[PDB]
Structure 1
């Protein structure tokens, strides 16, 4: 259970090919979390390819009144 990272050598956690959001930042794109303790490469976000074309548009048809908090 030894992993080599750019920051250094990590012992006690197993690398996982799966990707999630960062929970405990380790560095160099590596984040660790407890689910056993697993370290992984953090996931930037859900990929979304938009179909762009030169004669098509997308028009909204409905709305939502959202409320957000800022402290």
Structure 2
């Protein structure tokens, strides 16, 4: 999957990120640990290739 840095998606599975235009990857709402860092909070991984928002960590509410 190719990423066009700093170029809007209208000038070139299409996803728009702050880093640029990402082609060939599908966005998934689920959060995981970062496998391949892309930038601006988006990470990519292979499971086809998916793009997701990286998860900071498991939530733990202390009582």
TM-score surpassing 0.5? yes
Q: TM-score, normalised by structure 1?
A: 0.71
Structure 1 segments of 4+ aligned residues over 6 angstroms from their partners: none
Q: Which runs of 5+ in 2 are unaligned?
A: 1-12
CA RMSD of aligned residues (A): 0.3
User: If each structure's strand is expressed as a fraction of its own residues, which one has the higher value?
Assistant: 1
Distance 1:33 1:50 in 2: 32
> Paired residues, what number?
51
Extract unaligned runs of 5+ from structure 1.
52-71
Shift of 1:30: 0.2
Match of 2:21 in 1: 9
Structure whose alpha-carbon radius of gyration is higher: 1
**2:50 match:** 38
How far apart are the structure 1 equivalents of 2:30 and 2:61?
21
Q: How is 1:20-35 mapped onto 2 (pairs within 5 angstroms)?
A: 20-35=32-47
